[PDB]
Structure 1
Amino acid sequence: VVKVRGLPWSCSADEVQRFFSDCKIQNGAQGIRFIYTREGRPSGEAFVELESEDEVKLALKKDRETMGHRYVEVFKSNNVEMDWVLKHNDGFVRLRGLPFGCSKEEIVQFFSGLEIVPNGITLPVDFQGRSTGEAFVQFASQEIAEKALKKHKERIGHRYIEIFKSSRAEVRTH
C-alpha cells in the first residue's frame, strides 16, 4: 500500500505501471487502484499495491519524479487506509484548473450568490509550497452547491473554472 498524489486526471492504469517500472505491482494493473470522485472522474491521487515489503522502498524512492510535465508525490500507506475510500447530503465542490495567484477573495467574488460555509475554500498546496491549481468549497446546502455546478466553466481571468460535485472524504484526502 503506497499512496500517490499529483497524477493527471487524463492518465491510464498502464501509465502508472510504466512510471513504477522498477517495482513489481501486485495484481498486475488491477493493483494500481485509482481514487475517484462522487462525479465518477479520477481525482488525481491513486493507491498503488506494491507486492514485496522491499519494493515499498523502491516505490517511495521516486518521491518527486516528473511524470511528463508535473511532479508526482509518493508516500507509504497502510492496507486499512486503502480500505477506507469513498468514490461510489454533502455540499462540497471540487474546483479544478485555477489561475496561478488565485485568492480566496477571487473565488468568493466568483460565486457571488451561492453561500459558502465559514472558511469553505480549502485551497491546498503542493509538497514544494505552491497552490495545486485545484481547490475545495463547502457550501451552506447541497441544493446551493447544485446551483454552483451550473457555472461549470465560467472565465476567472482567462480560466474555465471546472466545477465537480465532491464530498468530505475527498476533502479529508486532498
Structure 2
Amino acid sequence: NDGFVRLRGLPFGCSKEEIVQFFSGLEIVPNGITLPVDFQGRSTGEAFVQFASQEIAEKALKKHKERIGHRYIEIFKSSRAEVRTH
C-alpha cells in the first residue's frame, strides 16, 4: 500500500490545515503532505499526499475537482519514487 497521490491547482500558499480537511476522514501519515518550497510548484499548486494505505489513496482519488476556496483541486495517482525524484 504505497498510498501516494499528486495534487495540482492548490491555491498559492495553501496550508496543510486546508489540505488535511479537504481529505477529512482519509488518514494521512505523519508529515504525509509534501509541499514545493519553490515558486513554479507553488504557482502550479502541486503537492504530494501520502495516505496510510493504497485503499485510502484510492478513495482520495474520487475528490478530483472538489474545491479549496475558489480553486478546483486536481488529483492524480502517484508513487514513493515520484515524491522523492520530482
Q: TM-score, normalized by length of structure 1?
A: 0.46
2:47 counterpart SS class: coil
Report how far residue 173 of structure 1 moved: 1.3
After superposition, residues 44-59 of structure 1 pair within 5 angstroms as none
Contact in 2 for aligned 1:99/1:133 (Cα 8 Å) = yes
The number of equivalent residue pairs is 86
Contact in 2 for aligned 1:125/1:132 (Cα 8 Å) = no
169 and 155 in structure 1: CA distance in 2 versus 1, 3 angstrom threshold: same
Contact in 2 for aligned 1:90/1:168 (Cα 8 Å) = yes
Contact in 1 for aligned 2:28/2:50 (Cα 8 Å) = yes
Question: CA separation in 1, counterparts of 2:63 and 2:41?
Answer: 29
For 1:147, which of 59, 64, 78 is the aligned residue? 59
Question: CA separation in 2, counterparts of 1:118 and 1:165?
Answer: 20
Report how far residue 101 of structure 1 moved: 1.7
Report how far residue 97 of structure 1 moved: 1.2
1:121 counterpart SS class: strand
Structure 1 window deviating more from structure 2 (121-130 vs 138-147): it is: 121-130
104 and 131 in structure 1: CA distance in 2 versus 1, 3 angstrom threshold: farther
Question: CA separation in 1, counterparts of 2:56 and 2:13?
Answer: 26
Report how far residue 125 of structure 1 moved: 2.3
Deviations 1:37-72 (A, max 9, x none): xxxxxxxxxxxxxxxxxxxxxxxxxxxxxxxxxxxx
Give the structure with the larger strand fraction.
2
114 and 128 in structure 1: CA distance in 2 versus 1, 3 angstrom threshold: closer
For 2:14, which of 80, 102, 108 is the aligned residue? 102
Report how far residue 135 of structure 1 moved: 0.2
Report how far residue 109 of structure 1 moved: 1.0
Question: CA separation in 2, counterparts of 1:164 and 1:129?
Answer: 15
Structure 2 residue runs of 5 or longer lacking an equivalent are none
Give the structure with the larger helix fraction.
2
| Same amino acid, percent of matched pairs | 100
After superposition, residues 20-169 of structure 1 pair within 5 angstroms as 89-126=1-38, 133-169=45-81
1:102 counterpart SS class: coil
Contact in 2 for aligned 1:126/1:132 (Cα 8 Å) = no
Q: What RMSD over aligned residues (CA atoms) do the two structures have, in Å?
A: 1.9
